[PDB]
Ligand binder design. Structure first.
Ligand SMILES: NC(=O)C1=CN([C@@H]2O[C@H](COP(=O)(O)OP(=O)(O)OC[C@H]3O[C@@H](n4cnc5c(N)ncnc54)[C@H](O)[C@@H]3O)[C@@H](O)[C@H]2O)C=CC1
Ligand SMILES: NC(=O)C1=CN([C@@H]2O[C@H](COP(=O)(O)OP(=O)(O)OC[C@H]3O[C@@H](n4cnc5c(N)ncnc54)[C@H](O)[C@@H]3O)[C@@H](O)[C@H]2O)C=CC1
Ligand SMILES: NC(=O)C1=CN([C@@H]2O[C@H](COP(=O)(O)OP(=O)(O)OC[C@H]3O[C@@H](n4cnc5c(N)ncnc54)[C@H](O)[C@@H]3O)[C@@H](O)[C@H]2O)C=CC1
Ligand SMILES: NC(=O)C1=CN([C@@H]2O[C@H](COP(=O)(O)OP(=O)(O)OC[C@H]3O[C@@H](n4cnc5c(N)ncnc54)[C@H](O)[C@@H]3O)[C@@H](O)[C@H]2O)C=CC1
Ligand SMILES: NC(=O)C1=CN([C@@H]2O[C@H](COP(=O)(O)OP(=O)(O)OC[C@H]3O[C@@H](n4cnc5c(N)ncnc54)[C@H](O)[C@@H]3O)[C@@H](O)[C@H]2O)C=CC1
Ligand SMILES: NC(=O)C1=CN([C@@H]2O[C@H](COP(=O)(O)OP(=O)(O)OC[C@H]3O[C@@H](n4cnc5c(N)ncnc54)[C@H](O)[C@@H]3O)[C@@H](O)[C@H]2O)C=CC1
Lengths: 496, 496, 125, 496
């Protein structure tokens, strides 16, 4: 509907209009009260826009011998903290304005969850379905060169990741290209990209984790009646029904990772049609037809559903397909109590207005889609430390804990001894799984759940400081802006 | 009026529609006749667009302590031949589309006059008049960094030059910035930029030469009745009156360098008003008020002229102010026989239609504004060879020619001798000026006049090969396209 | 390092135009870098001057270096600093004293008894 | 006897002939069954050969003023995973084919024990004994330059280590040379080489550990009657006699590190003669004459033994001198039950045939000489993390464990208290040594023993999956090949 870039920009102001006041008070100086206001406002006029944008065109030769051109983009929003990150989106609806927007979000999202990165986002006007695997690989390996050739790819400057219509392959084709032209002498060449296969430097839960970040976000608000008492809902996933808008990696892995804890799906909607079954749907069964058919229309254990998922009665609505999915023309027909934006700005500033009036909890992209980022932060480290986590200590930490329990056992016996004879001090079931120390699978699962809780705590803490009620979205930007700001300010806005 | 970028693009097609046929015949291969046509058309779909475009934003602190942001652009059209060049334009009417357009021209212009460069063009949304000399220098030195910081400035990749609202200062501020951050270890750091002051590696006639390129272009068609017989005009500058649209470096130095050979100016028009005097105008006198007043309104020896210069009766119309100056709304009122585009596409595709119907000779930007390029090609060399031209031979070449004349004298005497006694063989007046060899002032003056004639010869030669008559513009693109094409073709369109 | 200068006589817009120029010339000659040489604060400096050195190296040379913010220490917290950056020097002093006062092996010579609750001290500057 | 390079190559096939079948099944795709077979076979035709080989020659000036030339080699086998490693061998029997072979092994060995490195190996036609310490240092420091000068030395590309006829000195001369020409600006310059002295970035147990890797390998099969029931032997080192073929760092430190646990040596053989004493031999006493005499012939507490060590009756035969030591001409006279190849392919494909027929357990170089690699993996890390392991936590981890025991003590007292008064919970003896956390000496000792066990577990696990019985050698390659393969496959075999 509107300029997707200005939409995001319209939000950002809402947050800044608010923090401005307190933000001036924090600022310590001898300036006039108004001059301080002109310091902060000036900085905020620097943060909002993107600093670097690159638009380029490719000659490529097809399989049939004919050439065509390709249009590709790559934006960097903020250099307050490097590297910069973002994904590569293959799509025909790519545009400079969508890229600049999404770049801005990655900058604020990363500040919500305290990961030391800036924001970027790429794009390619292309539809992969129309091209082979020998043409998509001849594009990607050429896209990578031109950027590296101009300083937009690198372990320490900019780091791409997966996004719509990409996967691990495309990341395996970027790595070999950088590492085999420039990275050869760089000891950190495989850190140029995340989302890689396991055999190329990846991480367990690379993709499942996004879905889990969603979950651990929901689980971190459902556990508080402080807000569900407003909604008129009771905590518990065994009591909830949800629907999904599209099957990305978010839609599936968010779906099944819910299904494990009693959350019932009732329908799902792809780009080609919805399908509904009030008795439930089995995501395991769903992957089955996707390998045998490609689409969900034709699934035997569900009824083809006529109408938009957005018009389905449910308890939680998961938009995961694409931004702009929910507008003011249909917001009044939410038919659902919570909305969880797993889709990079599906809603609108108006919808937000509707959903405050209707008392609808909307979970923002921020803090909700920040799972796939932290993980990619753990894959960037893994490849800078050149070692599996904990490998060095698995055997040492294992028995160090076994010599500890013997020091309890033997000191206790020492006093009572014969009183009860010998007192075996042995692990439990789960500690026996965790006695050798942390494995990557465990660091990941935990670090994620930790960050998410830590952050929501900071979010809900300011929403009450300012009494934003359900307007969580604004509650987030305030934290982001408040952090980013400190960096430019303390930094001496420029080095000129 | 229209998309300045598409305008240029609409032209480019006109030329390609024509050369296509012959271009296929030149192409040697075993493909089918149609397949060859799909080879050339595919390439032509690669040439037309720009390959790299960069949009960036700057935080800068003013003198009053307040920050503002600045929007800057830099396009590279073609890498068929490096370095890439183009100027830096300071103006508030800067836009991505103007930059991409002008970049394309520099690519074709440089191929008309056979200089081994590609095309670029920069821009900055700014009005210098509103800023100090301590703010313009704090912008420029920051603009330079960000680009170099991303691989768009360098002796061997990209080389900026002056353009509207800039000069030698700004080039003195770019050099010291590159040479003092990156160029330190590069032996060719001062070749990163042209248009420099003399004391920093410049060239005599740096700026006057553009005006002269104009002249030597006109002089290379006025000398042929083959075309002025159509116009109904007689050769000779002592017989011509001309007007000028704006006083850049083109408007002045083109004006006075004409005045030397009997070409009479009757008016001139700045951004603030025209001024007309049918008895003539003295450009020497004109620089006088410009140092004492700034504008031409108020000049005592000319009458303030009410109306657009474009509505003045004359023999030659020199648009030099800015593109788009002459459109279809006023083209029918040309009131002039020749037009000489010293202004980067002042006219339109429609105007061209009008001016063919009216039998009006239009001299294209191409081949006409290519003076300031060749010179900048001689300044890039001067600074790669690290020596004044000819210095090594001035004394050797001087007497070598003096020992030659003695070998004539002494051999002649040897036979006749007493017949006439001694036979002094001595230089003339001008050879005595040219006996020591070429000085930079002489290489420049000559190399320029040479190229220009060589090129017009190739231009008029194809215009007759295809019978384009007065449509010189299309006659140029055909040569350009025909050259550029050979490069992509023979090169193996890509290295992927 | 060193600079013949008295900061008190200069503004904050002149001290920052010095520092950012000092940094260049050295880096320009191989005396600043994460792996070659690393400056820190000393008399008459602080965290500001370290915030002006970082942005200058990172914005000319460090751009491609993944370790650009390691070129300097004493930075502000928001630029890669550490808790107790400055308080710790004082504490190092303390933990040094505390590590000899705890031994009569030497205070028996001095004729003093262990214990800070029993001591008076003075400070020079 | 045969082409040492083809020998290794003949093995590699044996393993690939086997895994091929299962390897195709793992491969998931839509290709034809035969096409998949042509995918795997093609890859296996890529793995087997070495990718880079460098042969170079040096002019060096001796002490007597006379020059001579030197021939040096450096091979890199696989770039599937960088850095590449291998040692520098000074010897007159160096050849391109020996280097390519050994390089291949290092590639497979490193995959057995899961260290992220490839394979390399160097060489120099030289006999150190004939040259001074001022000539060997003038060679080494020149060898290093030429390679670095061509991209074969570096923390992130290639990393040399010690081997036959070298030591820590030569590594101290390589470091100062790289760090003082190229490494100056590299923060990781001391990671260019391993095997360094302690004061230059080395590790405790640098060299002793190889011997221990041997031990921990033997100890990991002797502990299982599953295989010694075949051999007809009983577990226990206090019950075993062994002999050693040469005194490298392996022969000594493997010998004494056995002697600690009741393993009796009966003879040993150097390049100049054997020596036997059935009552035992004292390795401490053995270092004594080596400092006072150089050779073992003349040792008072042992009888000079006439004949090859390989002809000695024993229980375990440790070849440590040099490859090819045991052939088919003498294999039938093994006179020993287990053989443990600490010597980079002492045996042959035929001997293997003999030793399967004779039911002789042969422990392969792979998994047995992989001690000196893991350690060098811990020295490469130490020097990338720029810190002693654990330093940061010794004091924190120490009392954190002391505040833990008080939380047991105080909670127990809290309930029982007076029942038994105070209940001192204090460490044991050894935990008091391990309460402050891990020191490098402890990480090393443990990490080594861990890896070795983990790996043998994987080895014996597949030998039973395929029923290879005693043919452990083939059981190893299958794992290696199975790992390496996944990397090329998932990687998109090439980036072209
Ligand atoms: N191409 C490269 O340089 C890559 C290196 N790595 C390294 O591996 C670590 C993370 O992954 P891993 O620890 O490997 O995964 P991991 O922690 O699950 O265990 C190692 C795995 O990598 C494979 N592997 C190990 N050594 C190998 C070798 N020499 N050849 C072929 N495959 C081998 C094994 O199949 C094993 O499953 C990082 O510390 C990084 O240094 C990881 C990915 C790519
Ligand atoms: N996949 C990821 O790693 C991440 C995804 N996201 C967000 O999650 C959303 C979905 O996940 P992705 O894997 O990125 O996408 P995806 O690559 O899984 O594709 C989305 C799926 O939804 C369907 N779809 C597309 N347009 C639709 C429409 N208008 N209505 C209904 N269904 C439609 C398509 O069939 C497609 O298979 C995206 O929009 C993206 O913004 C955000 C961060 C990371
Ligand atoms: N900063 C730099 O490195 C520059 C070097 N040059 C060099 O000069 C040549 C072109 O210009 P020139 O030949 O110099 O102009 P030129 O050919 O007119 O004669 C040399 C001029 O440069 C000045 N000059 C010569 N040596 C000088 C010195 N040691 N210190 C100060 N000024 C000096 C003199 O005033 C003289 O007028 C090029 O070959 C280039 O190598 C030119 C410009 C800048
Ligand atoms: N100056 C150069 O080195 C080159 C200039 N050109 C072309 O020549 C033209 C003029 O020369 P430059 O020195 O670039 O410009 P300039 O920087 O000399 O400025 C043009 C002058 O014309 C006047 N003017 C501006 N807009 C006008 C309008 N709409 N109507 C009438 N007068 C106006 C202004 O007062 C200004 O002083 C430019 O448009 C440019 O496209 C092309 C190549 C090189
Ligand atoms: N030349 C270099 O840059 C080297 C640096 N190292 C550093 O040391 C660590 C590993 O070895 P260490 O921890 O040193 O061994 P370590 O862990 O046993 O303890 C430090 C030892 O290094 C020596 N040492 C420490 N600081 C020193 C200084 N300023 N001058 C002279 N000698 C000093 C001491 O004798 C001490 O025994 C690595 O983290 C690495 O960063 C190690 C070897 C060479
Ligand atoms: N030393 C090391 O770090 C490593 C050694 N190895 C293997 O271990 C073996 C021995 O250890 P290194 O220290 O490398 O060798 P080394 O440098 O200790 O020398 C081997 C010793 O064995 C003796 N010897 C040489 N040729 C002999 C022959 N034909 N018969 C009997 N004795 C002979 C020599 O006197 C020499 O002192 C080598 O062959 C090598 O392949 C493998 C990996 C690492």
């Amino acid at each position: 509907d509107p300029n997707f870039f200005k939409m995001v920009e319209g939000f950002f102001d809402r947050g800044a209009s608010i923090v401005e006041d307190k933000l001036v008070e924090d600022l310590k100086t001898r300036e006039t009260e108004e001059q301080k206001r002109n310091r902060v406002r000036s900085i905020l006029r620097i943060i909002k826009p993107c600093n670097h944008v690159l638009s380029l065109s490719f000659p490529i030769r097809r399989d049939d011998g004919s050439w065509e051109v390709i249009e590709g983009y790559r934006a960097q929003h903020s250099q307050h903290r490097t590297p910069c990150k973002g994904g590569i989106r293959y799509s025909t609806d790519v545009s400079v304005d969508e890229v600049k927007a999404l770049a801005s979000l990655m900058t604020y999202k990363c500040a919500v969850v305290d990961v030391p990165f800036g924001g970027a986002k790429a794009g390619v006007k292309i539809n992969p379905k129309n091209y082979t695997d020998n043409e998509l690989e001849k594009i990607t390996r050429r896209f990578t060169m031109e950027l590296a050739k101009k300083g937009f790819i690198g372990p320490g400057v900019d780091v791409p990741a997966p996004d719509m219509s990409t996967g691990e392959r495309e990341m395996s084709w970027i790595a070999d290209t950088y590492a085999s032209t420039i990275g050869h002498y760089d000891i950190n060449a495989h850190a140029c990209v995340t989302g890689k296969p396991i055999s190329q430097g990846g991480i367990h839960g690379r993709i499942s984790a996004t879905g889990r970040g969603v979950f651990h976000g929901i689980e971190n608000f459902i556990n508080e009646a402080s807000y569900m008492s407003i909604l008129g809902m009771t905590p518990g996933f065994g009591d909830k029904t949800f629907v999904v808008q599209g099957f990305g990696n978010v839609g599936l892995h968010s779906m099944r990772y819910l299904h494990r804890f009693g959350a019932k799906c009732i329908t799902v909607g792809e780009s080609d049609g919805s399908i509904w079954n009030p008795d439930g749907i089995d995501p395991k069964e769903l992957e089955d037809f996707k390998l045998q058919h490609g689409t969900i229309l034709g699934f035997p254990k569900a009824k083809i559903y006529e109408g938009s998922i957005l018009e389905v009665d449910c308890d939680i609505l998961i938009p995961a397909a694409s931004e702009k999915q929910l507008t003011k023309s249909n917001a009044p027909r939410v038919k659902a109590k919570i909305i969880a934006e797993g889709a990079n700005g599906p809603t609108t500033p108006e919808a937000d207005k509707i959903f405050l009036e209707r008392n609808i909890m909307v979970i923002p992209d921020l803090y909700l889609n920040a799972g796939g980022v932290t993980v990619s932060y753990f894959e960037w480290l893994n490849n800078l430390n050149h070692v599996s986590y904990g490998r060095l200590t698995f055997k040492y930490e294992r028995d160090s804990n076994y010599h500890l329990l013997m020091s309890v056992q033997e000191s206790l016996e020492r006093k009572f001894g014969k009183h009860g004879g010998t007192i075996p001090i042995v692990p439990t079931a789960e500690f026996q799984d965790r006695i050798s120390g942390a494995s990557e699978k465990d660091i990941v699962h935990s670090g994620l759940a930790y960050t998410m809780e830590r952050s929501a705590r900071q979010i809900m803490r300011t929403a009450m400081k300012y009494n934003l009620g359900l307007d969580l979205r604004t509650a987030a930007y305030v934290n982001a802006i408040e952090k980013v700001f400190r960096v430019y300010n303390e930094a001496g806005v420029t080095f000129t």
